[PDB]
Amino acid sequence: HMELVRVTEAGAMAAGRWVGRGDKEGGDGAAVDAMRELVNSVSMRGVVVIGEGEKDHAPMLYNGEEVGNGDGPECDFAVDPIDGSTLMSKGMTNAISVLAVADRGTMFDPSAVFYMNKIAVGPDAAHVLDITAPISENIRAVAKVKDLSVRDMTVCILDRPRHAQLIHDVRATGARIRLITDGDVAGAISACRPHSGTDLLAGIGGTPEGIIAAAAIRCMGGAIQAQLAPRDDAERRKALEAGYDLNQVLTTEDLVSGENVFFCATGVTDGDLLKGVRYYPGGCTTHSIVMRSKSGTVRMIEAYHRLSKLNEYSAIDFT
Amino acid sequence: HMELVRVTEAGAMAAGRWVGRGDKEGGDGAAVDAMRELVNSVSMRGVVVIGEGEKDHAPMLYNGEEVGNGDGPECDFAVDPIDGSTLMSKGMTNAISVLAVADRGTMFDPSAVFYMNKIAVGPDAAHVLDITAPISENIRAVAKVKDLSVRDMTVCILDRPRHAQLIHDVRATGARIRLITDGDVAGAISACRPHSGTDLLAGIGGTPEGIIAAAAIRCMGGAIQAQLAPRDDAERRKALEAGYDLNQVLTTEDLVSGENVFFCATGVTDGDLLKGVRYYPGGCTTHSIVMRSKSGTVRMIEAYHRL
Amino acid sequence: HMELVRVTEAGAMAAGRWVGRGDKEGGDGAAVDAMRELVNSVSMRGVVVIGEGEKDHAPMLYNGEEVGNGDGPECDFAVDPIDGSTLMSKGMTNAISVLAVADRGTMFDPSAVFYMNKIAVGPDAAHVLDITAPISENIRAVAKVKDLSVRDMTVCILDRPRHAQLIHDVRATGARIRLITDGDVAGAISACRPHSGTDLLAGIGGTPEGIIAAAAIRCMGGAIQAQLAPRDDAERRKALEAGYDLNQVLTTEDLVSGENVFFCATGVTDGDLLKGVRYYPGGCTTHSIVMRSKSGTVRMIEAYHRL
Amino acid sequence: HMELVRVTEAGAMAAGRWVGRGDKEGGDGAAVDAMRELVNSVSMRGVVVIGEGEKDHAPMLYNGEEVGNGDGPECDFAVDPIDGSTLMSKGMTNAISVLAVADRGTMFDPSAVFYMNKIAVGPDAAHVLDITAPISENIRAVAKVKDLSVRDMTVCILDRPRHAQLIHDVRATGARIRLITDGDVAGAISACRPHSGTDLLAGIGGTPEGIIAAAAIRCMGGAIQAQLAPRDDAERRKALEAGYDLNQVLTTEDLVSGENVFFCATGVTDGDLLKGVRYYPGGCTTHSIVMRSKSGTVRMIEAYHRLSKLNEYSAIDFT
Ligand SMILES: O=P(O)(O)OC[C@H]1O[C@](O)(CO)[C@@H](O)[C@@H]1O
Ligand SMILES: O=P(O)(O)OC[C@H]1O[C@](O)(CO)[C@@H](O)[C@@H]1O
Ligand SMILES: O=P(O)(O)OC[C@H]1O[C@](O)(CO)[C@@H](O)[C@@H]1O
Ligand SMILES: O=P(O)(O)OC[C@H]1O[C@](O)(CO)[C@@H](O)[C@@H]1O
Ligand SMILES: [Mg+2]
Ligand SMILES: [Mg+2]
Ligand SMILES: [Mg+2]
Ligand SMILES: [Mg+2]
Ligand SMILES: [Mg+2]
Ligand SMILES: [Mg+2]
């Protein structure tokens, strides 16, 4: 179902006009609108499971909203218009626009708790992860199964005060850290991609972002392990009376359980996997990735969009 | 509909298992087989107007064969499972696998005349083409528009005895030549893409190949011009009381006039446009180009298939 | 002399062993060490005019240090072992290792004033620059020359409190911004290279970094303009009775006036110009750019070193 | 000694003006002249060991001619201005311009015999070659040591009537053939390059070309084995009374024996390793490879040559 890439293409192109303009909500809204317009044109019967929030504080792509033209089987729809609106609003690297689709009911509930602790690797270390052990243990286990020196392991980590210990422990291990200021959907995918220069994603980030990353891991190979991370005892009580086993280790398939899973993403700014939107006299280029669990096929898709006429402008070159 | 790339992806993956094995027919047939299998699983209602040939000497993708499951409007379908299967069999560069789709009835008749004189150039210099003028004047006007000296120009020409005069005339002007043994669909698309190393395509080649190239040009921009080139007086006989004016310059739209044109190609061997199929233990990678006329969107598609 | 790439190759290979380890000084020092070791083995007679700083608080590549074995004429030498070592330490993109060489005495004084307001653009639009005009008018004139809308433009600006007004004014016009935390040598070279995603560099940054960028621009084309930006009245004091007119617009040649200018850089981490150093069992690959003013030849150099 | 790449850059740029122009001698002469002018500017003390012939039928770069500015140690110089002038003159793929430099006296004598039988592989099969065994044996041995299926082996072979048996035997093995019409210096290097799509070069080609390929193999890793291949009994007698053991198997180090070996090459037409000369409004690009035995460093060098003024033209983009 390659056509879904046009949804993240439209989101990235809409957000491209807000890159560096210091207005996170302006580019968010632009991306959301462009993506909803395109997803309703697609032959698919979606319900927004991960979106912009719930029916009020989210005017569009709210949790529960129906999407697609009506035609198609009913499925779960997850969208992150920009994974890290602040990267977009400041014009820094690695902002991406994201969607995932899976069988109806197979996506974990993103409202369970705001945060989850995470660790993710690529397929050749997919069975040695233990999110309950310290990071040094995970690093050494991944290092050995990969036959690498620990000092050549690279761990992607959100730069946050709450990660002071995790960062220290990775360094004391001797491994390296790629500090990111936002975007652990992108950081999760780079850990799982075979030869990307990051071996591991570790740390607490958003629960919706963990689920969307699980969808991509479901298609691409690898594993993420996660645990819900209540912010305080109030939120801990909520998740407990809601039925959640706060000791459960969530695996990739726990977060997205369908057998038909689809993921795609388009660069908004230049990143370690996707180039951002680039502008030219005649139009723009987008750079996307598309993948499916059923076939395991992964597609890199570079597109030249004519922002109008034919023969009016020069031809277009693609790296 | 992007899904149509899987047809050339299937054709190339099948043809790539025959690259460099010395068997034109074995690779050609595997490619036909795979593309027919896959085209009948896409949501189209198509009719082959360009393919392997007539129903008798061609069991698959024959003229008139209905392809697709098939939903959608009925439309013209044009396949070239490998544009120059000799390239594939000898392991040479620039073998591609190609299909085009357009509104039903909007493709030129591939059987009017076997051969067509062609000239094709990209968007920047399309406006200066005139296939009735001598090749020297097209070269100098294209070169001027491109801000190149004539000696910077590189003209792609099929290596054939029939092109001795054309080749002499291009050499006389001072331009460089890229002689190709086969494949003037690939050669035409290269003339129209930037930074390909080819600035112009010229000479006589297959009429079906001219039509497929025009479908691509409808999508990515540029222009091809063409004039039917009857082999003998019997074909000129056949051509004129079919109703064809052979002083008529065919433009891109005369060859493919649909408002809804689709084109895609996948590399079989490495070329100046697309990498060829690469195999490895877990799978294979294909490199494709996809384009549509109504949007003008051109897509480069690298696919890692896990077999 | 192409051989000088090995100095930045050595600086980057040393700095790459520190990428992502949280130690600014450890990577910076390893890079200094490796570049000093290697520069003294090339056939040059150079004098560091831009490096690590004064002889007291900088043992290596200090101001005045003679480098090379050394043959050849005496010349100006300028090193930046890592342009923004924070980038290296946090594993962020666009860390490069840089050197420039020019005729002796032809580089501007890096110590006149600490900071310089800059604007830099590539060859196509260099002729429209005016650093005295408002940033909005430079953007619209550059954009027109490039045949871009203003909203297609991407302006690179160091993320600093001092740039709040500049950033507001660029946002007011509608252009996009690429905010960088460090490294306006890399940012300047990116403004001047095509298809980099950056169309313009603007704002205040280090005077030594402006000079190194100008050496590069002397070689690959484009223009930088600059105006000294004294921090306090004491520096304006210092600047004026040094003899500087601070209504004076500095052009590229005012910063580096040699007829013989050399520039090279090697990637430390991945950037919009150069891939970073990649290690593997047998060895490592570096990605470099090399350029000279008298020929204008620009060289991209990928090196597979077997360790 | 990176500056030597400017010699093959000048040869390729001079030959670029003759690509497809149907005049092999015209582009040969242009390349020869441009290369000699640049090599005499280089600080080096060369004697042309492999050149355009001997002092008469070769006006320039003749066997024995001295090259370089005088400064420098004395060394052996081998130059092939275009490896396959017919590829150049017809505008077909894989024409390259080549030079090699080694310690004085360490290059085999290219006049010993016109032809030599050859087989070459990359470093991971460098010890399983036996040029005296049939090709099927070599293919299976290389296939096993590389852990590949034979049917995935690709053998580069000059398309020649004299190779009818060799071609048949490769196919009957099940391996694939990349037929080339000229240029077994380029075909040798592609066999030795690790992931180029050709695994093997086999067959009889020119003796100078085998020696130049040995120089590149000396730097890059791999091995070539060769035997002289007399064209008739007249030539067989010559090589015999000259002292040559016609049964000797020549190894890489027999063909080029120095410990300081240098090789570089520049594309003239587009090839499987180097792009050809490409022209632009402002100038041209060349694509070169440079390597040294002493360090084993291999350099890919893409250069933009301004065929004149600064700021007068557009900027330049490199894949
Ligand atoms: O910004 P917080 O509160 O630390 O939460 C982290 C989350 O924010 C993002 O960086 C951007 O929304 C996500 O990538 C990540 O999951
Ligand atoms: O081989 P012929 O008869 O000259 O016809 C040329 C045609 O053959 C092909 O090389 C493939 O059969 C086409 O690319 C080209 O149009
Ligand atoms: O960090 P400051 O004081 O604003 O100075 C900016 C300078 O710092 C650097 O980021 C590196 O120190 C340079 O690229 C830049 O010119
Ligand atoms: O052309 P011949 O006589 O078969 O000899 C082969 C030689 O010719 C070349 O193809 C070009 O001179 C060389 O690459 C090869 O060594
Ligand atoms: Mg997010
Ligand atoms: Mg990885
Ligand atoms: Mg064909
Ligand atoms: Mg700096
Ligand atoms: Mg030769
Ligand atoms: Mg190989």
Residue numbers in the entry:
A (entry chain A), D (entry chain A): 0 to 318
B (entry chain B), C (entry chain B): 0 to 306
Task: List sentences from the manuscript.
In addition, we present structures of F6P-bound forms for two variants of the active-site residue Thr84: an inactive (T84A) variant (2.3 Å resolution) and a partially active (T84S) variant (2.2 Å resolution), the enzymatic properties of which have been described previously. Although the T84S mutant was co-crystallized in the presence of the substrate (FBP), only the product (F6P) was found in the active site, demonstrating that the enzyme is still active, as has previously been observed. One Mg2+ ion is found in T84S MtFBPaseII, coordinated to a glycerol molecule and to Asp79, Asp82 and Glu208 near the cleaved 1-phosphate group of the substrate. Although the serine-variant enzyme has significantly reduced activity, the hydroxyl groups of the wild-type and T84S MtFBPaseII structures superimpose at approximately the same position. The hydroxyl group of serine in the T84S variant structure is rotated compared with that of Thr90 in Ec­FBPaseII, perhaps explaining the lower enzyme activity. It is conceivable that the phosphate group of the substrate could orient the serine hydroxyl in the variant into an active (although sub­optimal) conformation, as suggested in the native Ec­FBPaseII enzyme, and retain some activity. The T84S variant structure has the most visible residues in the structure, ten more than the apo structure. In the two variant MtFBPaseII–F6P complexes (T84A and T84S) the C-terminus is ordered (although with high B factors), with a malonate molecule from the medium found bound in the center of the tetramer at the interface of two monomers, occupying a position near the location of the AMP allosteric site in the Synechocystis enzyme. In the T84S mutant, the O7 atom of the carboxylate group of malonate is 1.1 Å (0.8 Å in the T84A mutant) from the O3′ atom of the ribose moiety of AMP. The T84S mutant also has a glycerol molecule in the active site of chain A near F6P.
